[PDB]
RNA sequence: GAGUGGCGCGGACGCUACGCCGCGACGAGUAGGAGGGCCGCUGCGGUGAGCCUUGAAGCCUAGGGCGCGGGCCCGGGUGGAG
RNA sequence: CGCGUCCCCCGCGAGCGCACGGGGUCGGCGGCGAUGUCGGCUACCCACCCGACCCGUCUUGAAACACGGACCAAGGAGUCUA
């Protein structure tokens, strides 16, 4: 019926300037623009949903092309509502500036 | 970063004889046991000396 | 016929149990007496200060007996005289901490390394969390964690330091056996200060972190511990 | 109905890639077989950022899972049926492996015996 | 003695087989089949062997006798046990414990006998 | 003996 | 081992002081009503 | 011989009892409570008789077994765990089941079951959600609570009643149990105006609606 | 610690002692030194009732793997005598 | 917190059970599965982000506008005696 996930942009990796740590990603969740607002999103499940050539099995359905890398929002990055997330596979740099879905599925409210 | 000098951290004494002779190497097994198990410091000195080179254990005259 | 062995081996088992309880009660009552002492020490420094103010005089409190010296600068490019003193203070690594008793011989060893250390006059609570959280005993030349009192009773018991509280009392209230109880402690492996340093290079007085922070080491111990 | 090992822990590996030799990519005369660079100016030798890694002892695999195959067994290499009875007591820990230069007819004997003795073989269907 | 002729055999015996970071002994009376002081089956005065039968069915238990130990042809006294599993394993337990015969090979012999009885059982 |  | 006794005493004292504080605030509310 | 009294020291904080061991010695009255100091079953046989062996020694030992492991203490099974609720999930509250086939649906909470899973019946009439379990973590608790306090939820519909037995076909029991609870809640969600329409409708994130912003 | 006195036939694992186990601290590196290699090449004495025309060596390999590495073992192809 | 005994001030009780107690367990579950699907980390190709100058050498200092090296195979340098 409706959207049950919040719009996050994979802005880039946790990096220095001349070193990047690919294991941690830096999400930009739409609406939250301060460390105050990002208290809600800590521990939330987040998916990089993409689609590839070959039909992979879909749990609760027949094989679609759409795939996921399941992540978790770990903590607040920086001062301005950015958030660190850590994925079961280090995200591809294909997805820098593309949509990942921070879900409300690990609710605390 | 710890300011240690590793120059002398390895102690350069014998743990065992350099020899492959079995009769000595059985006497070492016997005094490996007696040294560490008995409270006697004698057995520690005998074990220590079974390791040592031909030149370090020179012949004692009658 | 074993009935005597069975009974005798159970009496020995029991004699050590009642002996534990008696030591366990001593350790309990020693700590209860120490709570009474720290009250009286803290309360008298107020009492003395007050009657001096009532008179219109001043109460200059005792120059402190006990410092907690943390190393704040690293291992690279250090003068030989500074190297030597820092390893006599057992500060061989950045953010290592040791308790140092103040006298004339010690304070001239803490001005010779002033740029490289941050020290002060630690609180009672600073001595607690350091000895409990970070407290590792040097037992048979091995850094072994103070997880039971009998680690402290086996090394230091000949100086009548038979529990964690006896060690804390001997450090804070710099006792006759401060040297042995302090050398028993391994230098405290403290983490980097959470919220940051102000400025490593310069002295605390000129907006830095190096040198003497009298009351103010306790702000940074709680930050680093 | 494959043979299970006694215990199947997590074979954790600190690196899965090969330590390829410095400038083995550039030249065909240079093999991939690792050689420590001992050049005075060698970027790889003196650990510049973003260069080829040098194999340390640090990458050493956990001793409990070292030489352990993905199946949880370790290889023991077997030339004939007389070297199987070696393994009939180290059965749940070690798997047999028939050597390349063992004949077709002699594998048929080893594989069939190993099934009797409940010994796992890594290459049981290797001539036929 | 045993401890001496271990120091000869430990590395350079014909039965010794080193490969794949493993060490084995193909000696005719070693139960755990491994290069070990305890398990070596030529070196001790008392030795327990467990082999399959001359037939297909049962286990032979090789006791080495106390007396003629320079006398190979009479030194090993073999007894075939062709019974149910539980009683084959019981007989071996009684032989070793209740004769006191090398009683620290008591369990290795049973585990071996058990694995021989498993072997000569028809496959599903 | 006191707890007898 | 004495830490348990010290903690119990601390918690009890804190609870008693909080009850006294609530009573004083009630007295203050009554004074404001007066 | 003695019925167990319940612990005389009330729990002040977890681990620490309110009364000292001198006050407790007094409270237990240990000043007048002081005190001084199989296998073989012979069955007859129809010979003589036999002595049969209970738990006979095993017929197969493997080539190697694993050693018995060390003993921890705080590692109970799931049957013996303590079950948390939030302050927000109280009986009567309307939840938003987030994750299921019933995702985004506004659904009435009944009771915390004895597996930590919530019992939830967004009336089958409105939501098309039955007598069903949900997980707390996979549910938003809304600040919209009906007065459910008067209902009689049956004992027999417990954790073992909603456990997947293994085609799924609805038992005539599960239809009776539905309606018996469905009939007690439906007149209480109609006592609040515009509420049944809310339960029929499904939760969505539309443009500008950021879950952190909306307190509810 | 010891001497004279007032029913059921049972119990994991181990200890190549050149082995196995435990606890602590530590780990840049040219020239250079030392050690250990179940790293590799070729020949000799022993040894494996080894392997091999039902296919040795060599070679190729988008195959399965092992070792920190030197390297190695398996699969498949080629080959024909070690 | 029995008391048999000692005087200044006036040597072993039995049970049970809970656990902030010497390093994780569940006596909790749920999906999927034969011609399109699962796993396969490594290896083949490709893409993207970050890093990333060419080795050997003499040198205080080499990516150097220092020298040697187009490419490949095979050979090729601390030996033996005293």
Swiss-Prot record, chain A:
Localization: Cytoplasm
Q: Does the keyword Transport apply?
A: no
User: Which Gene3D superfamilies does the protein's record reference?
Assistant: translation elongation factor selb, chain A, domain 4
GO BP term, example? translation
For this UniProt record, give its keywords in alphabetical order, as a comma-separated list: Acetylation, Cytoplasm, Ribonucleoprotein, Ribosomal protein, RNA-binding, tRNA-binding
Listed InterPro entries:
Ribosomal_eL33, Ribosomal_eL33_CS, Ribosomal_eL33_sf, Transl_B-barrel_sf
Q: Which GO terms describe its molecular function?
A: structural constituent of ribosome; tRNA binding
- As stated in the Swiss-Prot or TrEMBL entry, residues carrying the post-translational modification N6-acetyllysine are 7, 62
Disulfide bond residue pairs? none
- The keyword Lipoprotein is assigned to this record: no
| Recorded GO CC terms | cytosolic large ribosomal subunit; synapse
Q: Name one Pfam family in it.
A: Ribosomal_L35Ae
Indicate the principal place this protein occupies in or around the cell. Answer: cytoplasm
Q: Which residues carry this modification: N6-succinyllysine?
A: 62
Assembly state and interactors? Component of the large ribosomal subunit.
Q: What does this protein do?
A: Component of the large ribosomal subunit. The ribosome is a large ribonucleoprotein complex responsible for the synthesis of proteins in the cell. Required for the proliferation and viability of hematopoietic cells.
Q: Which family does it belong to?
A: Belongs to the eukaryotic ribosomal protein eL33 family.
Q: Tell me what this protein is called.
A: Large ribosomal subunit protein eL33
User: To which species is this protein native?
Assistant: Oryctolagus cuniculus
What is the phylogenetic placement of the source species in the record? Eukaryota, Metazoa, Chordata, Craniata, Vertebrata
Swiss-Prot record, chain C:
Question: Is Lyase one of the keywords UniProt gives this record?
Answer: no
Key words, A-Z: Acetylation, Cytoplasm, Phosphoprotein, Repeat, Ribonucleoprotein, Ribosomal protein, RNA-binding
Which Gene Ontology terms of cellular component type are present? cytosolic large ribosomal subunit
Q: Species name for this entry?
A: Oryctolagus cuniculus (Rabbit)
Under NCBIfam families, the record lists:
uL30_euk
Q: Which domain of life is it from?
A: Eukaryota
Give the modified residues of type Phosphotyrosine: 116
Q: What biological processes does GO assign it?
A: maturation of LSU-rRNA from tricistronic rRNA transcript (SSU-rRNA, 5.8S rRNA, LSU-rRNA)
The protein's location, in the record's own words, is: Cytoplasm
Protein name in the entry: Large ribosomal subunit protein uL30
Q: Which family does it belong to?
A: Belongs to the universal ribosomal protein uL30 family.
Q: Which residues carry this modification: N6-succinyllysine?
A: 104
Its biological purpose? Component of the large ribosomal subunit. The ribosome is a large ribonucleoprotein complex responsible for the synthesis of proteins in the cell. Binds to G-rich structures in 28S rRNA and in mRNAs. Plays a regulatory role in the translation apparatus; inhibits cell-free translation of mRNAs.
How it assembles, according to the record, is: Component of the large ribosomal subunit. Homodimer. Interacts with DHX33.
Q: What are the recorded GO MF terms, alphabetically?
A: RNA binding; structural constituent of ribosome
As stated in the Swiss-Prot or TrEMBL entry, residues carrying the post-translational modification N6-acetyllysine are 101
What InterPro entries does the entry give? Ribo_uL30_ferredoxin-like_sf, Ribosomal_uL30, Ribosomal_uL30_CS, Ribosomal_uL30_euk, Ribosomal_uL30_euk_arc, Ribosomal_uL30_ferredoxin-like, Ribosomal_uL30_N_euk
One Pfam match: Ribosomal_L30_N
UniProtKB/Swiss-Prot annotation, chain E:
Modification N-acetylserine, positions:
1
Q: Give a yes or no for keyword Cytoplasm in this entry.
A: yes
* Gene Ontology biological-process annotations: translation
GO MF terms here are: structural constituent of ribosome
Keyword Ribosomal protein annotated: yes
Phosphoserine sites (modified residues): 114
The family database entries (InterPro entries) matched by this protein are listed as: Ribosomal_eL28, Ribosomal_eL28/Mak16
Q: Which GO terms describe its cellular component?
A: cytoplasm; ribonucleoprotein complex; ribosome
Subcellular locations according to the entry:
Cytoplasm
Q: Where is this cross-link: Glycyl lysine isopeptide (Lys-Gly) (interchain with G-Cter in SUMO2)?
A: 57, 64
Which key words tag this protein in UniProt?
Answer: Acetylation, Cytoplasm, Isopeptide bond, Phosphoprotein, Ribonucleoprotein, Ribosomal protein, Ubl conjugation
Q: What is its main location?
A: cytoplasm
Assembly mode? Component of the large ribosomal subunit.
PANTHER family (alphabetical): 60S RIBOSOMAL PROTEIN L28
Q: Which family does it belong to?
A: Belongs to the eukaryotic ribosomal protein eL28 family.
- What does this gene product do? Component of the large ribosomal subunit. The ribosome is a large ribonucleoprotein complex responsible for the synthesis of proteins in the cell.
* UniProt protein name: Large ribosomal subunit protein eL28
Curated annotation (Swiss-Prot), chain G:
* PTM: Citrullinated by PADI4.
The subcellular location is: Cytoplasm
Entry-annotated residues carrying Phosphoserine = 33
Q: Which positions are linked by Glycyl lysine isopeptide (Lys-Gly) (interchain with G-Cter in SUMO1)?
A: 32
Q: Which residues get modified to N6-acetyllysine?
A: 4, 32
| The protein's assembly and partners | Component of the large ribosomal subunit. May bind IPO9 with low affinity. Interacts with RBM3.
Q: What is the annotated role of this protein in its UniProt record?
A: Component of the large ribosomal subunit. The ribosome is a large ribonucleoprotein complex responsible for the synthesis of proteins in the cell.
Q: Which family does it belong to?
A: Belongs to the universal ribosomal protein uL4 family.
Q: What is this protein called?
A: Large ribosomal subunit protein uL4
Its source organism is Oryctolagus cuniculus (Rabbit)
Its organism's taxonomic lineage begins at: Eukaryota, Metazoa, Chordata, Craniata, Vertebrata
**Range within the parent protein:** 330 to 363 of 413
């Amino acid at each position: 019926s409706g959207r049950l996930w919040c719009k996050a942009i994979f802005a880039g990796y946790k990096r220095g300037l001349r070193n990047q740590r690919e294991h941690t990603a830096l999400l930009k969740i739409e609406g939250v623009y301060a460390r105050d607002e990002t208290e809600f999103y800590l521990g939330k499940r987040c998916a990089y949903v993409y689609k590839a050539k070959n039909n992979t099995v879909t749990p609760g359905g027949k094989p679609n092309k759409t795939r996921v890398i399941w992540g978790k929002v770990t903590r607040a990055h920086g001062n301005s509502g950015m958030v660190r997330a850590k994925f079961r596979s280090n995200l591809p740099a294909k997805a820098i500036g593309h949509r990942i879905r921070v879900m409300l599925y690990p609710s605390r409210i | 970063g710890v300011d240690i000098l590793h120059n002398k951290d390895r102690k350069v004494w014998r743990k065992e004889p350099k020899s492959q002779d079995m009769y000595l190497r059985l006497l070492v097994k016997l005094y490996r046991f007696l040294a560490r198990h008995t409270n006697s410091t004698f057995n520690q000195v005998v074990l220590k000396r079974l390791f040592m080179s031909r030149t370090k254990r020179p012949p004692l005259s009658l | 016929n074993f009935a005597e062995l069975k009974i005798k081996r159970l009496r020995k088992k029991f004699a050590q149990k009642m002996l534990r309880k008696a030591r366990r009660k001593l350790i309990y009552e020693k700590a209860k007496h120490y709570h009474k002492e720290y009250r009286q020490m803290y309360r008298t420094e107020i009492r003395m200060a007050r009657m001096a103010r009532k008179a219109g005089n001043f109460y200059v409190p005792a120059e402190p007996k006990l410092a907690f010296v943390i190393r704040i600068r690293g291992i690279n490019g250090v003068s030989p005289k500074v190297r030597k003193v820092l390893q006599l203070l057992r500060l061989r690594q950045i953010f290592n901490g040791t308790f140092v008793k103040l006298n004339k011989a010690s304070i001239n060893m803490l001005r010779i390394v002033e740029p490289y250390i941050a020290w002060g006059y630690p609180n009672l609570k600073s001595v607690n969390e350091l000895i409990y959280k970070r407290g590792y005993g040097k037992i048979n030349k091995k850094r072994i964690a103070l997880t039971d009192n009998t680690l402290i009773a086996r090394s230091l018991g000949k100086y009548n330091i038979i529990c964690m509280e006896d060690l804390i009392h001997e450090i804070y209230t710099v006792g006759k056996h401060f040297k042995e109880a302090n050398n028993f402690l391994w230098p405290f492996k403290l983490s980097s200060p959470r919220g940051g340093m102000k400025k490593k290079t310069t002295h605390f007085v000129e907006g830095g972190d190096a040198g003497n922070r009298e009351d103010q080491i306790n702000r940074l111990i709680r930050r680093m511990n | 109905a494959a043979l299970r090992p006694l215990v199947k822990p997590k074979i954790v590996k600190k690196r899965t890639k090969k330590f390829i030799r410095h400038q083995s990519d550039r030249y065909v005369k240079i093999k991939r077989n690792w050689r420590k660079p001992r050049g005075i100016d060698n970027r790889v030798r003196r650990r510049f950022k973003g260069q080829i890694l040098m194999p340390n002892i640090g990458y050493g695999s956990n001793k409990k899972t070292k030489h352990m195959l993905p199946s949880g067994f370790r290889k023991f290499l077997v030339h004939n049926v007389k070297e199987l009875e070696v393994l009939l007591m180290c059965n749940k820990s070690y798997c047999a492996e028939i050597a390349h230069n063992v004949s077709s007819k002699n594998r048929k004997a080893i594989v069939e015996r190993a099934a009797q003795l409940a010994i796992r073989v890594t290459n049981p269907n290797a001539r036929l | 003695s045993a401890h001496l002729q271990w120091m000869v055999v430990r590395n350079c015996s014909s039965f010794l087989i080193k490969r794949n970071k493993q060490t084995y002994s193909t000696e005719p009376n070693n139960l755990k089949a491994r290069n070990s002081f305890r398990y070596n089956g030529l070196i001790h005065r008392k030795t327990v062997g467990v082999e399959p039968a001359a037939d297909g069915k049962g286990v032979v238990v090789v006791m080495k006798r106390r007396s003629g130990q320079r006398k190979p042809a009479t030194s090993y006294v073999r007894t075939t046990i062709n019974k149910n599993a539980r009683a084959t394993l019981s007989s071996i337990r009684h032989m070793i414990r209740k004769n006191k015969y090398h009683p620290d090979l008591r369990m290795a012999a049973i585990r071996r006998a058990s694995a021989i009885l498993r072997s000569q059982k028809p496959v599903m | 003996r006191g707890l007898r | 081992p004495y830490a348990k006794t010290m903690r119990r005493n601390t918690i009890l004292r804190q609870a008693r002081n909080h009850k006294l504080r609530v009573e004083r605030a009630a007295a203050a509310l009554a004074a404001k009503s007066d | 011989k003695g019925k167990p009294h319940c612990s005389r020291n009330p729990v002040l904080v977890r681990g620490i009892g309110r009364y000292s061991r001198s006050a407790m010695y007094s409270r237990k009255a240990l000043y007048k409570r002081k005190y001084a100091a199989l296998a073989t079953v012979t069955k007859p046989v129809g010979g003589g008789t036999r002595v049969v062996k209970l738990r006979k020694m095993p017929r197969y030992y493997p080539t190697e077994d694993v050693p018995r492991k060390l003993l921890s203490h705080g590692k109970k099974p799931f049957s013996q765990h303590v079950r948390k609720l939030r302050a927000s999930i109280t009986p009567g509250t309307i939840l938003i089941i987030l994750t299921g086939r019933h995702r985004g649906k506004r659904v009435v909470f009944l009771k915390q079951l004895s597996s930590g899973l919530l019992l939830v019946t967004g009336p089958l009439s409105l939501n098309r959600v039955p007598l069903r379990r949900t997980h707390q973590k996979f549910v938003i608790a809304t600040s919209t609570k009906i007065d459910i306090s008067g209902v009689k939820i049956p004992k027999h519909l417990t954790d073992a009643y909603f456990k997947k037995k293994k085609k799924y076909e609805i038992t005539e029991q599960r239809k009776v149990d539905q309606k018996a609870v469905d009939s007690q809640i439906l007149p209480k969600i109609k006592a609040v105006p515009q509420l049944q329409g809310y339960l029929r409708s499904v939760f969505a994130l539309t443009n500008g609606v950021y879950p952190h912003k909306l307190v509810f």
